[PDB]
Amino acid sequence: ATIHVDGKEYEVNGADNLLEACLSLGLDIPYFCWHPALGSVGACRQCAVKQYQNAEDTRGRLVMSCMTPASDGTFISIDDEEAKQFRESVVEWLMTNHPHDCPVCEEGGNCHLQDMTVMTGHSFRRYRFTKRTHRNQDLGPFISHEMNRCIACYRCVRYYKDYADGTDLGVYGAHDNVYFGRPEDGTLESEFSGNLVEICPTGVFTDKTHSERYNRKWDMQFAPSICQQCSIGCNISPGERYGELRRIENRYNGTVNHYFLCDRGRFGYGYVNLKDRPRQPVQRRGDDFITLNAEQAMQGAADILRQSKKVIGIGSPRASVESNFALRELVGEENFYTGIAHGEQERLQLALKVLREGGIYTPALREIESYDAVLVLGEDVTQTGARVALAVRQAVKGKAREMAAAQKVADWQIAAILNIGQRAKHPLFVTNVDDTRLDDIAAWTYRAPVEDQARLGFAIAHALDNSAPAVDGIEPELQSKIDVIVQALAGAKKPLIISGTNAGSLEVIQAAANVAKALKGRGADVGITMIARSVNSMGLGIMGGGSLEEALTELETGRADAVVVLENDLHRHASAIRVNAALAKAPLVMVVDHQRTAIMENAHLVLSAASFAESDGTVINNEGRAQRFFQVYDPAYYDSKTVMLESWRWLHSLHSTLLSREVDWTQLDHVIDAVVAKIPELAGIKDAAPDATFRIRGQKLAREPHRYSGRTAMRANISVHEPRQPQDIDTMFTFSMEGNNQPTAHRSQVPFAWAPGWNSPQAWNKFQDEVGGKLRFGDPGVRLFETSENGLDYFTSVPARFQPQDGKWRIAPYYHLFGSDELSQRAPVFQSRMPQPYIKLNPADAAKLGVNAGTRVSFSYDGNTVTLPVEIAEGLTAGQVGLPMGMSGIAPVLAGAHLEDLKEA
């Protein structure tokens, strides 16, 4: 299409509206109610331009650019005097009731309303009457509410209800008394409620966790990082001030997470700021805990390791690829053990084999929204891979999108699309041990044990393809439900099969692979998604190694007398008594970690490792994409006694001091080169980000904005002499403002979005190739493996149906977005959001045991009689006890296990 803006010719997409087309061209049109991910509704009336009928037209008329298609031969003017006057008048009308709040408002300096007030040129107030006022609501521990600042742009309700499918936020009242919030005080129930603080263009919805230690956007030190709280790999911009992690902002990745995070990623960062974190190397000498610097810690550890007869290393899926590789190089490949249990390792390696050998394409997180039917087997996605659940909700809305496209409705006219679609949706079928949060939009939900969910998957695969193994013993009603799923999946152009390792069942993953293979054999464009457990579960699976049980066996038999545990608490993957006994038997325990864990009491040496905020590295997400995270700040800048290094730096220096008796702190690119030289399956992590020599016209990439303040005073109380700028030899970023963050700079790692005149998250428009698309020079992160040419065979190991044995209680896993992840559950703001510990019981089982809801019952696992209160689960099948995985005292390895003597305390 061809448009003429202010007498200048432009080539645009005709299927776009004029606002997103002009913003993609670099032109500035003020806007409030439009969002790239939410569509156009034409509410705020801010985006007025003057449209002319033809070239020889001087009158024109004011139109909404967001509601006007960018059709071929379209003549508009942005800088027309009447259009500018009307846009200024719209800002002025918004300003009549706006509170005098910018100094005490958390949005200030990051506020889209401030930016558009300045952009329209409105700075003189002639309104003299009263301003309307609203009372605020309590919205829970994450979101702070201030309705005075609302401009009634309806972005919050459109995102929360129409996009995120939330139910507890709405708009109330009428005329100028419209109110946006909950129907009563309470916590916002959506797992994606935290995106309101970026969706809202004003300071109505703000980050309460950031508000506690508030600082302005210009004062932040930003880095591009990867969220560490699950396996999805959403791109984040952590921002630090005064040595503490202050905020997690969304970093736009047009391939993975685009505009949105989940609440665990956004608000679960508080473990970085915990005061009990190790900051120096500490050696246990008898009952004394002496503090070492880096060099003598390396020398003492190297001497003791040299005296040892066999050193084993226990990695973790929390640690990066480089850290796990450095531990593997320190101890040797045959002495390296993954820190996860044997069953978890089997499930993770099966998921990896399905992903990189199954011949079925695995989609990125944005690509999930383009699928026409979804079958989720076993994986409680909202509690384990939440952003996948949000993308699945978008894929469900795809049917209304297609129906509206059949009626020649433009794809941005979202209200017309929703009106045409009504309650029609693409088919979604979820299976779990109980109800999920996707049940509101799912075409069907199967509440069954993991064996029965696997049998349902195998039956679906057999009915799709007769070469798949059959299932004997399916009831006719379950058969009818299976047939419903089969005709929904067979008639889909793009079916998607989602599973993962969190169900605790190998057979669930096998059944999902069988369904995907059966759909691939019929010629469908089938995709498969595997949800892993942790941020680098897939990287640890690719690297490989022995299980934690084998490492504990080596420690117990005395074959290994030295153990180096990297970033692993070891209690989530094995019983605490066995771990404690094996670690007490070992004459040397060294723990390299950034969190004070329970195994540090028996540790002979503790190395103060860096968390993700203080370290660089690579993590492989659930789709196999290698992504680099960069260090946010120097931990030694304020506290000069802090010796907190990257885990790979500690382990490389330990290996060098063990070999040549000399220290070697090395560089990140050297470790990455060693990884890609030694492990060819991880060769793609080299191209996840450019090396430390990368420059934009000779200059590095700035971590902090150009208006960063307090350089000669932030450390003045410690010393009036300003310290040296922290040097970054590892990456291409600099720990200063003296660098490049231009939106036109040829790079893919953007620490934060800022453009002149766009101080809010709307500056990501300037950083994109087209608005709502990808980053201008490509989204960061590369895929490790391509889709294989040939697939796997059908898995013939169809399990038998679940049978409740008397006196034995099968543990059904229950996951929680707030509580199941280890580091995020250590965050203090999550404790209020955390559910109270519980045990779920069937009504028949609770009546048989003579217990009601709330009564405290006790059970013994690995010789630990623990007591929990009972709540009644309607959807749980009898013979099962529902336990909250990943919580304190309940390890995630308990999923699929069995319970004895479960009786009332």
Partner: protein, 156 residues
Amino acid sequence: AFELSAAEREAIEHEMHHYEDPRAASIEALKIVQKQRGWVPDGAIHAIADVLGIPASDVEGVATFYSQIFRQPVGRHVIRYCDSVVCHINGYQGIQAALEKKLNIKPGQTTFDGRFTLLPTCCLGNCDKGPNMMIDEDTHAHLTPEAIPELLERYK
């Protein structure tokens, strides 16, 4: 707490039969609850939402959008005087002042005995016979300030 009565629930499902989407019975469900209890209390929002299968935020948005759905307690009789343009020409201000004097309450308020609540309302579609008022279900036209106390006695 709030519990929907059997008659209210049955009327709500009967209204749900009239449409292809049960959300379309939200206004009439709120009106049914208001007709039974004078107004719509806070628990009625959640009850109507549970019966209709729609979120409580949507029911509250509907209830607070429409002016004749009362989300605050009202008196036994709701006086609604027209304050629109033709009744302004015909002199609704004298009628309003007579109501002020007789009831001793401002518009939007309720009398101390809970007998009356005074409310302005938009044009009642009776402009040729103005000024107009609407007590609970009866519209009174050709109003004069002298006839207002006589009109208010027949609503006990």
